[PDB]
């Protein structure tokens, strides 16, 4: 499972992802596991 | 080959490099972790007169 990322945006436009930026890994983490579906976790009231 | 100081950067991740046809120009140590380039030595042709 690799997990790349890029932090700084570009105010190209307002509240949408418009422009390009390349992407360099950070985590290569070697587990060997069989994923079909994923969730998401946020913050509740 | 001859290895000199490298004026190129390599990112953290990626440890060898090349440029056409998997010709390794550039390479980092295991331990100095230093950035240094390759390059052939002067072979050539000899003529004679
Ligand atoms: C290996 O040891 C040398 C001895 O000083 C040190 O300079 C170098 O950073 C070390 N490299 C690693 C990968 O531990």
């Excluded at chain 1, 307002?14 to 998401?40: C, H, K, M, Y």
């Excluded at chain 2, 140590?29 to 380039?37: N, Y």
Aim: overall charge negative; some cysteine.
């Amino acid at each position: 499972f690799k997990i790349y990322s890029k932090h700084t945006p570009i105010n190209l436009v307002r509240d949408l992802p418009q422009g390009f930026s390349a992407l360099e890994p950070l985590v290569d983490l070697p587990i060997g596991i069989n994923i079909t579906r994923f969730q998401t976790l946020l913050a509740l009231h | 080959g001859v290895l000199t100081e490298s004026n190129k950067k390599f990112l953290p991740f990626q440890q060898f490099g090349r440029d056409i046809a998997d010709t390794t120009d550039a390479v980092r140590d295991p331990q100095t972790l230093e950035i240094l380039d390759i390059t052939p030595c002067s072979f050539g042709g000899v003529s004679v007169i």
